[PDB]
Design an enzyme around this catalytic site. Structure first.
Site, PDB file in Angstrom:
ATOM      1  N   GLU A 481      32.485  40.486  39.790  1.00 30.51           N
ATOM      2  CA  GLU A 481      31.039  40.735  39.949  1.00 30.51           C
ATOM      3  C   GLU A 481      30.605  42.174  39.621  1.00 30.51           C
ATOM      4  OE1 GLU A 481      31.010  39.268  44.021  1.00 30.51           O
ATOM      5  OE2 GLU A 481      29.804  37.516  43.377  1.00 30.51           O
ATOM      6  N   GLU A 550      36.785  30.834  41.831  1.00 28.01           N
ATOM      7  CA  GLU A 550      36.395  30.622  43.218  1.00 28.01           C
ATOM      8  C   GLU A 550      35.656  29.300  43.327  1.00 28.01           C
ATOM      9  OE1 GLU A 550      34.285  34.016  44.802  1.00 28.01           O
ATOM     10  OE2 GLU A 550      35.314  35.341  43.374  1.00 28.01           O
TER      11      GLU A 550
HETATM   12  O1  LIG Z   1      31.788  34.741  50.273  1.00 26.80           O
HETATM   13  C1  LIG Z   1      31.057  35.222  49.173  1.00 26.80           C
HETATM   14  C2  LIG Z   1      31.971  35.369  47.965  1.00 26.80           C
HETATM   15  O2  LIG Z   1      31.134  35.172  46.848  1.00 26.80           O
HETATM   16  C3  LIG Z   1      31.692  35.318  45.557  1.00 26.80           C
HETATM   17  O3  LIG Z   1      30.603  35.332  44.659  1.00 26.80           O
HETATM   18  C4  LIG Z   1      32.508  36.613  45.409  1.00 26.80           C
HETATM   19  O4  LIG Z   1      33.256  36.615  44.213  1.00 26.80           O
HETATM   20  C5  LIG Z   1      33.439  36.827  46.606  1.00 26.80           C
HETATM   21  O5  LIG Z   1      34.132  38.061  46.502  1.00 26.80           O
HETATM   22  C6  LIG Z   1      32.603  36.758  47.882  1.00 26.80           C
HETATM   23  O6  LIG Z   1      31.602  37.773  47.835  1.00 26.80           O
HETATM   24 MG   LIG Z   2      30.756  40.321  46.145  1.00 30.09          MG
END
Ligand SMILES: OC[C@H]1O[C@@H](O)[C@H](O)[C@@H](O)[C@H]1O
Ligand SMILES: [Mg+2]
Ligand SMILES: OC[C@H]1O[C@@H](O)[C@H](O)[C@@H](O)[C@H]1O
Ligand SMILES: [Mg+2]
Ligand SMILES: [Mn+2]
Ligand SMILES: [Mn+2]
Ligand code: NA
Ligand code: NA
Ligand code: NA
Ligand code: NA
Ligand code: NA
Ligand code: NA
Ligand code: NA
Ligand code: NA
Lengths: 1024, 129, 129, 250
Positions: A481, A550
């Site tokens: 990000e 993710e």
């Molecule tokens: O729990 C929220 C998560 O959201 C994703 O977008 C991010 O890559 C993670 O590091 C964390 O911020």
């Molecule tokens: Mg983040």
């Protein structure tokens, strides 16, 4: 800005005098630990800190001590502040590249002893494995250098500054800098020397500086391989190098915490089983390439390693230095648009893992990392993503030995630049195919900012060069990000230049202009599917694959629908799996005053608990494991959906499909659980299947022998035949017994032999039902049928809002009429209740008819609910009855799913069986929320002390139930805040809303939503 | 009175006098459930009710003993998890309490700490804010 | 070896003050000289709520040159972590095992739970006292 | 009583071939750790246990593993039984010096690698920091010795039995013996190699075996002191010893 030092506000000042990054190797003979107690003082800002060029040991000696390594926000009594949690928002104002002027500065000081001979014999360095945020280093009152990059290491040459006897090390550590802007991970803000510090003593005249090991297959058929070894020797006084490669140890090697952590060498004879030797000649290149005959492949499923010893040899023929390490024969390619290891298009069964310990923070003892990884292996995981920075250098050997596909990620997140934009434009949602346009508008501040190029390159250089010799790492990642910009392209060019052997990942680069892989986070199936089709041409060819770096956000009760993601993974060659966010809740242990108790209890902290100015609350509590790093129902479910063998039982047949990438099924013992005798299953290769005719209902696939960190008898996979709902053969007493019926002014009474039934006509409430020594009654607040649950983390952003808006928690039952008649077909009495069930302030509700048919030993309850009125809610959390259990109540037992909780979109890991409450450890959520439901329940037995059991079952369809004494879960911030009644209740539900992953990701899928509609269901309450 | 933890006639001197808040104290859980959580030499006790002030309790001419809990079934409980809990709290308000001793292995509760059979006379005030 | 025929020190476990005091007087001569001192190798058995009267033992230690203090039995409960079905709950919970929990033919029950610290090696009110 | 082995019922058989006790000093350069996973099997009694003089690594290799050091009554799922608590009462019948005939026997096996140069350079020993209740020790199918004393250590000379390459260590551990009668502390009855195991590599031609340090005050006024250092060196190939005492750390 002269009140803030130049180096703290200069993005190009990435380090001063730091040695170039080299491949990490721990050597007991070279590494001397400087861990332990150090003098330490904290200052408001740099200007209050002493000039280190004048700081004596006699002066520093008098300070308090802190123990290295540790964070200074994690000390006894919070001596030096408390942790701060932010997700996106920066905890500082944005004025790039300036940190705040008020900038916590910690000064560390200790001494070490140096020999007369030592300075003659060795080049002396200092190595710091990780310091947050940045620091300057002094030896003996002299400035050595400066460093940035919190999760990267650093070495400094110390030879010039060193003296015989007492030496003074002083380290000035700053919390904020220009670097802060690129270190905004969704985690705790913590500071200090949180990783090892070492004094290195390298042989002076000549020594091994860097090593490079590659394994490349010569061939399209992945047999013979070229082992390339390049050594950079520093100094002249050496003759040549020797290389010995040893016979492999199969990936099925047994390990434990003890052997994985053993660091002994020197006199320990590394290995004996020689496979290949090689020598360099005097005055020639200290590198070579050798052809290796059909070596054993390294794989995450079978991590076979070849140990080696590299010796630097002097003129006299003696060994100046040795490196003892391992080779993993494996090759990663982008081939026909797939990520390919050893020719094979693999599947990631992955997880994102932060460095986290509930007491030490990011200062995680290796012991604990081993604990993590063993647990992962025990739950079918094969891949880890280093979200979002490199770990302690010693961790990567663990990956090599245990077998994980690893994405090693640069320490670089820029997320905070988005927050003012998100707020200014009132942005509600981001979507994986569309969201990069929102990051594009703010990229110019950092990722497209030429002032930051050197820093971005440094994070890339440092990432790769330290960890380049670990076969488990197959992908380098540019960070997380950080939008997309010219600096990312620069990173990509540099990495391919430094390490051509691996692939590059970066999720912020939507179109992979400078990445080799496509990557989404939390996408819907529609969104995955569109992307697939737009990147698959007319031939069926794609150029790059998609992973989910993710997905299935594991916050609280959830995630839901891991099943539907997995179906997609197996179906299309374009999808190569993904990584769950996240491995574990980031809770910090602390002392909370209980809302239930007025007393102090151990609890796990998230945002707000340490009273931050700005924080992101519970969003740190999003793991498959809890803060103590133990499995939640999320992990239990994940292990099932990703099981590497499919077992299907239908039509008198067991069909077994091998779903591994590389290994056969030969190491597994298949047991017919109905007989306990093993099933002879042929050896199945990846993707091969067999149908075996059998009468079986339940088959388990288990480990034959101890292998890796798993024990003989460990369950890898299982399958069951579907269990039809059988009506239990309870015998209803229909004999003619006279019954005393009293239809009073307010209360209706039915008394017979062994039976006492009282109903409050005003409320629709069972005052008391006592059959054969067993008592239940209505748990009544407003209505006899209730709809509310304590909102899950996933419920919070939308569904909870809706349910609250529609007043579902304030449902009232307004009785219209009660009908009372004598029994007919063997019954004693029929009591019929006509009412409207509707919340205050609203039109919508159910025209309800509750018919109680009362027998001597049974009560039949028929419920008819007809949804009426304008302005209806979309869905409900649940629908069902609540009963108080009598004082006699002792335990319960059920036929259904178990041993743990189950929900419509999170239930398949809980197999069918007969379960006893006594055999089960009830799971406690770190953040209190909806829990302890059992779905697809065939029947429930509730045992009363010395009075037998009450059997409960629903006609034609399985039901849901919870039995607890808990309340006040909604308002409870921590486990200790949960209130408990003096007796238990049964929550008996016809239906329950799914769980989903909407805290971050898709809503509960349509077929799992409890949609607003008419309800019709019949229950029997059968008393023994 | 004495705090922050529990105190008993022959086991109390480590608990110094002061004003103590139940919220600041981590209540001790015994591995084997038994008599616990008594506070001896109590000068006065304030019990706080949500949005209704406090109830102040004191004994005339002599300090008293108290326990506040929701626990029961301690006798039969073999382990901490076996301990039963009511849906509301109770106050155990005591004029006197027997000492603790070391008789499982060693001397009985010493004579001056034993709550000997005798007449009892005591006055309490229950003062409502 | 009660009379220290082959030891250099006198040693008692869990004695009463009367018993300590008789011993002193029988081994202090007319001059006020004694040949060997007394220690309490074990005293103030720390099982559960207790020990009581550590005060009165200490008064004795400081008062006489003949007494050179002692050692509390014991540092910590020997509880082993296991899973217990709750009597309150009908469910499985983490608990600390003593005799009987592992279903021994013969065992000595709770007598293993006699520490100043609990099974998890954390301070009890005994250690605080 | 031939159904119970002689050494388990002989109070005088305190050890066989155990080196004399010396003052303990840990040295990273000499101590190599043999802790970690070992092949392991449990047997009802000694007669069910294999003859270690014929046990191959190929045979042992196939057993389940246990991690050393640990008790075998404290394993995942109580695989090898559960702890037993007695205060006073023996958990066995009294028939001194006989242990019960039914006597849980655990056999441990692992390998370690030895260099060509290592056997030339070093005298090799095995040191066990604690094993409950007693055990016999085998290297490369050959009987090294026997030991009693659960919380005491033991060292054994291994030089005669050692080979270049793979070496096999087998340890037969017994729960009860004549020794049980003198090990009746008020505590949990637990068994196994519950403390460190080490391979010691001492310099061969000459090495420091034992050291003795005493501090005695010369005076009634407790000021000047005599520091006495006695060293027992083993072997001839040495010249002398040096001693350096450093300034104190408060
Ligand atoms: O729990 C929220 C998560 O959201 C994703 O977008 C991010 O890559 C993670 O590091 C964390 O911020
Ligand atoms: Mg983040
Ligand atoms: O808690 C009882 C204690 O009694 C002592 O006499 C004995 O020396 C201790 O080992 C222990 O048994
Ligand atoms: Mg005893
Ligand atoms: Mn709380
Ligand atoms: Mn219990
Ligand atoms: Na952040
Ligand atoms: Na696929
Ligand atoms: Na989060
Ligand atoms: Na809550
Ligand atoms: Na009890
Ligand atoms: Na004295
Ligand atoms: Na005891
Ligand atoms: Na005993």
């Amino acid at each position: 800005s002269c009140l803030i030092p130049e180096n703290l506000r200069n993005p190009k000042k990435v380090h001063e005098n730091r040695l170039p990054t080299r491949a990490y190797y721990y050597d007991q003979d070279i590494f001397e630990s400087l861990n332990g107690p150090w003098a330490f003082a904290l200052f408001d800002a740099p200007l209050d800190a002493p000039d280190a060029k004048n700081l004596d040991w006699e002066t520093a000696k008098k300070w308090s001590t802190i123990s290295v390594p540790s964070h200074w926000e994690l000390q006894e009594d919070w001596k030096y502040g408390k942790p701060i949690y932010t997700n996106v928002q920066y905890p500082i104002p944005i004025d790039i590249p300036n940190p705040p002027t008020v900038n916590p500065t910690g000064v560390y000081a200790r001494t070490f002893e140096l020999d007369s001979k030592s300075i003659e014999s060795f080049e002396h360095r200092l190595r710091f494995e990780g310091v947050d945020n940045c620091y300057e280093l002094y030896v003996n009152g002299q400035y050595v250098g400066f460093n940035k990059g919190s999760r990267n290491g650093a070495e400094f040459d110390i030879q010039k500054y060193v003296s015989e006897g007492e030496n003074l090390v002083v380290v000035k550590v700053f919390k904020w800098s220009d670097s802060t802007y690129i270190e905004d991970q969704d985690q705790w803000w913590l500071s200090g020397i949180y990783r090892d510090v070492s004094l290195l003593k390298l042989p002076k005249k000549a020594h091994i500086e860097d090593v490079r090991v590659t394994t490349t297959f010569v061939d399209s058929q992945y047999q013979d391989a070229e082992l390339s070894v390049k050594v950079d020797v520093q100094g002249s006084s050496y003759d040549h190098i020797n290389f010995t490669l040893y016979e492999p140890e199969d990936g099925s090697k047994v390990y434990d915490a003890s052997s994985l952590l053993n660091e002994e060498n020197g006199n320990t004879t590394f290995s004996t089983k020689e496979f290949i030797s090689f020598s360099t000649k005097k005055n020639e290149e200290t590198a070579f390439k050798i052809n290796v005959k059909a070596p054993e492949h390294w794989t995450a499923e079978n991590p076979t390693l070849y140990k080696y010893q590299l010796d630097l040899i002097g003129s006299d023929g003696s060994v100046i230095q040795s490196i003892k390490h391992h080779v993993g024969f494996r090759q990663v390619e982008l081939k026909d648009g797939n990520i390919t290891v050893n020719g094979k298009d693999i599947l990631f069964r992955g997880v994102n893992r932060h460095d986290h310990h509930p007491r030490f923070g990011r200062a995680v003892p290796l012991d604990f990392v081993v604990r993590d990884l063993i647990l992962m292996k025990k739950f079918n995981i094969n891949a880890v993503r280093n979200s979002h920075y490199p770990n302690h250098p010693k961790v990567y050997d663990l990956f090599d030995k245990l077998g994980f596909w690893v994405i090693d990620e640069a320490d670089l997140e820029t997320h905070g630049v988005q927050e003012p934009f998100n707020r200014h434009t009132n942005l509600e949602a981001e979507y994986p195919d569309t969201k990069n346009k929102l990051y594009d508008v703010n990229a110019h501040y950092l990722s497209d900012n030429p002032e930051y190029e050197v820093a971005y390159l440094d994070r890339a250089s440092q990432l790769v060069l330290r960890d380049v010799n670990h076969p488990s790492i197959i992908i380098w990642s540019l960070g997380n990000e950080a939008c997309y910009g010219r600096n990312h392209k620069a990173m990509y060019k540099l990495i391919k230049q430094l390490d051509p052997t691996r692939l590059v990942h970066y999720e912020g680069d939507l179109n992979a202009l400078s990445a080799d892989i496509f990557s989404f986070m939390y996408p819907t199936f529609e969104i995955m599917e569109r992307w697939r089709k737009n990147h698959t041409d007319e031939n069926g060819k794609f150029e790059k694959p998609l992973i989910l770096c993710e997905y299935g956000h594991a916050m609280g009760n959830g995630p839901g629908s891991l099943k539907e993601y997995q179906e997609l993974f197996y179906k299309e060659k374009f999808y190569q799996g993904g990584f769950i966010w996240e491995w574990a809740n980031h809770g910090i242990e602390f002392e909370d005053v209980s809302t239930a108790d007025g007393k102090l209890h151990k609890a796990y902290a998230y945002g707000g608990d340490f009273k931050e100015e700005v924080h992101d609350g519970v969003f740190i509590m999003d793991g498959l494991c809890n803060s103590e790093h133990n499995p939640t129902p999320g992990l239990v479910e994940y292990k099932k959906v990703i099981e590497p063998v499919h077992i299907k039982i239908a039509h008198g047949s067991v069909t077994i499909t091998n779903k591994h990438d590389f290994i056969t099924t030969d190491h597994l013992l298949f047991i017919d659980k109905d007989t306990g005798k093993t099933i002879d299953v042929p050896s199945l290769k990846p993707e091969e299947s067999v149908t075996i005719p059998s009468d079986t209902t339940y088959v388990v696939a288990v480990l034959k022998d101890d292998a890796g960190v798993l024990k003989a008898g460990h369950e890898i996979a299982w399958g069951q035949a579907e269990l039809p709902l059988k009506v239990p053969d309870f015998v209803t007493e229909t004999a003619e017994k006279a019954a005393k019926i009293n239809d009073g002014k307010r209360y209706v009474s039915v008394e017979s032999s062994g039976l006492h039934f009282i109903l409050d006509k005003l409320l629709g409430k069972i005052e008391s039902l006592k059959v054969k020594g067993k008592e239940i009654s209505s748990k009544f607040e407003g209505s006899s049928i209730t709809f509310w649950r304590p909102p899950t983390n996933n419920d919070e952003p939308r569904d909870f809002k809706n349910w609250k808006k529609y007043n579902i928690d304030l449902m009232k039952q307004n009785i219209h009429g009660v009908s009372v008649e004598k029994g007919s077909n063997g019954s004693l009495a029929v009591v019929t209740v006509n009412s409207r069930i509707s919340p205050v302030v609203f039109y919508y509700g159910f025209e309800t008819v509750q018919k109680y048919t009362i027998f001597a030993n049974k009560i039949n309850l028929n419920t008819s609910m007809k949804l009426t009125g304008e302005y209806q809610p979309p869905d409900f959390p649940r629908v069902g009855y609540e009963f108080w259990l009598g004082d006699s109540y002792e335990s319960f037992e059920w036929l259904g799913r178990g041993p743990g909780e189950s929900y419509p979109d999170k239930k398949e890991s809980q197999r069918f069986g007969l379960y006893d409450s006594k055999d089960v450890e009830e799971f406690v959520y770190d953040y209190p929320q909806e829990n302890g439901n059992h779905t697809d329940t065939h029947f429930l037995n509730i045992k009363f002390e010395g009075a037998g059991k009450l059997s409960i079952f629903q006609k034609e369809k399985p039901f849901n139930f919870k039995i607890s004494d808990e309340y006040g879960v909604d308002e409870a911030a921590h486990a200790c805040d949960v209130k408990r009644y003096g007796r238990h209740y049964l929550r008996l539900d016809h239906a329950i809303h799914g769980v989903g992953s909407e805290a971050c990701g898709p809503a509960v899928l349509d077929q799992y939503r409890l949609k607003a509609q008419d309800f019709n269901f019949e229950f029997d309450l059968a008393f023994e």
